[PDB]
A paper describes a structure:
Examination of the sequences of this segment in StSurE and PaSurE suggested that D230 and H234 of StSurE might be the key residues responsible for C-terminal helix swapping. The double mutant D230A/H234A had no detectable activity (<0.1%). Comparison of the thermal melting profiles of the wild type and mutant SurEs suggests that the double mutant with a broad melting profile might represent a larger ensemble of structures in solution. The structure of D230A/H234A was determined by Molecular Replacement (MR) with Phaser using H234A mutant dimer from which residues corresponding to the C-terminal helix (residues 227–253) were deleted as the phasing model. Examination of electron density map and geometry of the model revealed that as in H234A, in D230A/H234A mutant also, the C-terminal helices are largely swapped. The final model for D230A/H234A consists of 245 residues in chain A, 244 residues in chain B, 230 water molecules, two glycerol (cryo-protectant) molecules and two magnesium ions. In both mutants, the two protomers of the asymmetric unit are related by a rotation of 167°. In D230A/H234A, the loss of interactions due to mutation of Asp to Ala is compensated by the formation of an inter-chain hydrogen bond between H228 NE2/A and T232 OG1/B (2.79 Å). In D230A/H234A, the segment 147–151 of chain B is disordered probably due to its proximity to the C-terminal helix. The loss of D230/OD2 - H234/NE2 hydrogen bond also leads to a large shift in the position of a loop near the active site pocket such that the mutants can no longer bind phosphate required for activity.
Author numbering:
A (entry chain A): -2 to 180, 182 to 200, 209 to 251
B (entry chain B): 3 to 80, 82 to 146, 152 to 204, 206 to 253
Write the structure that this text describes.
């Protein structure tokens, strides 16, 4: 029953209908602090903005927008400075458009969640497979948060949630999925004065399939980029050709 | 060699590397037509990407991503390269940022396509020669399915101490959040170390602090660590589809 501290961010910026819908739904049963970008960051790199002062705007309701802040900037500032006591969880969304595939790491929605993966509860990244039923997506997120406060799930990770763009009553249920994959298939030029020649035009368990079949898709993600297997197969490769003239 | 980057075909880091590498190896430059450090690094999956070709051979993909430059370079524009390299970046690529880095991304498209790949970055602004020298030394190797991720101190080559096989950190422990004001009184926040330290003994972060070339074997993480049943059981135990 008790009040969970939620850091809410996104990719689409403080004004987006997705984050503002979710925030209203969440403020009914949780303490919500919005720290989001000052603009829509679709197509924009994610990174922590280091050693460069970030200006902070405060809205009437207390939402805060970070001037030129990436989704990771917002999460970093929210976790370490802007939400006191420190948030229990980071929620990122609701994003306008899906976040499916192995390409999700390059998305700002996932990136914000990823930045909040070390908190008390695993981070949620929430995307709507469209632009209409934010209500459905906000409902699915609430169910998830209630569940986490009931029986906690292991931290250090994120759940990537994709919600079909459907009325709540038409959603068939929730599946635990794994990410899909979309991609040599390059084509030919067609410029009117032939300005250039070199051109391009570039599973039953995948997240794509569950969403297409009308289900909420939940993919558990973690970041691990090193093998102890690689660490010394290049270390003995380095000490092979050491210092010498 | 296919040489690309994140900061553009005219970038100092890539030009200094392409010149130093043209000593030992043959290089084909395919890089974005503009600085992309602020742009997303995914492939542009369903559009027609124009290319520009300079007198020296260099190719610039118009509005290209760093991965686009590797994909479009290999399977459409360039004999097949021996090693795909991602030019000397202006600025570090340390810890969590490697997931987000355009420089790292370009190397990643390389090994997905099935090539050896190198990504290199300068922790500063001045000593591209130092970084080029380090890369040339490294490329001079016996001439893993993982990319090396290399970070170089911004020092004259003679001031550089060693070379460390490192792993990635998350975020630097020394990087704190420091509240500030501007002359207008606006509230501002500054992320980073107030001076000097305390980094993980084996991390990419640590090496650079101590004047050492960080080299990390790398592969991006979209895995679950087979934690699919852990969550599957969690949705059954707690009512998540109940209230509808
Ligand atoms: Mg977005
Ligand atoms: Mg760059």
């Amino acid at each position: 029953m008790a009040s969970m501290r939620i850091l809410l961010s996104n990719d689409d910026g403080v004004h987006a209908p997705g984050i503002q819908t979710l925030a209203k739904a969440l403020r009914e049963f949780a303490d919500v602090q919005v720290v989001a970008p000052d603009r829509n960051r679709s197509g924009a790199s994610n990174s922590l903005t280091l050693e460069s002062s970030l200006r902070t705007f405060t809205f009437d309701n207390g939402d805060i927008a970070v001037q030129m802040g990436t989704p990771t900037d917002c999460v970093y500032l929210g976790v370490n400075a802007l939400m006191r006591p420190r948030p229990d969880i980071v929620v990122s969304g609701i994003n306008a458009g899906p976040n499916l595939g192995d390409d999700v790491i390059y998305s700002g929605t996932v990136a914000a969640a990823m930045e909040g993966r070390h908190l008390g509860f695993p981070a949620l990244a929430v995307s709507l497979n469209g632009y209409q039923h934010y209500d459905t997506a906000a409902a699915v997120t609430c169910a998830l948060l209630r569940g986490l406060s009931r029986e906690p799930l292991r931290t250090g990770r994120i759940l990537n949630v994709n919600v079909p763009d459907l009325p709540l009553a038409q959603v068939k249920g929730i599946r635990v999925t794994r990410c899909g994959s979309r991609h040599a298939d390059k084509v030919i030029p067609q410029e009117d004065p032939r300005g250039n020649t070199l051109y391009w035009i570039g599973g039953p368990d995948t997240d794509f399939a569950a969403v297409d079949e009308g289900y909420v898709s939940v993919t558990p993600l973690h970041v691990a980029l090193t093998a102890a297997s690689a660490h010394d197969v290049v270390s003995d490769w380095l000490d092979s050709v050491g210092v010498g003239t």
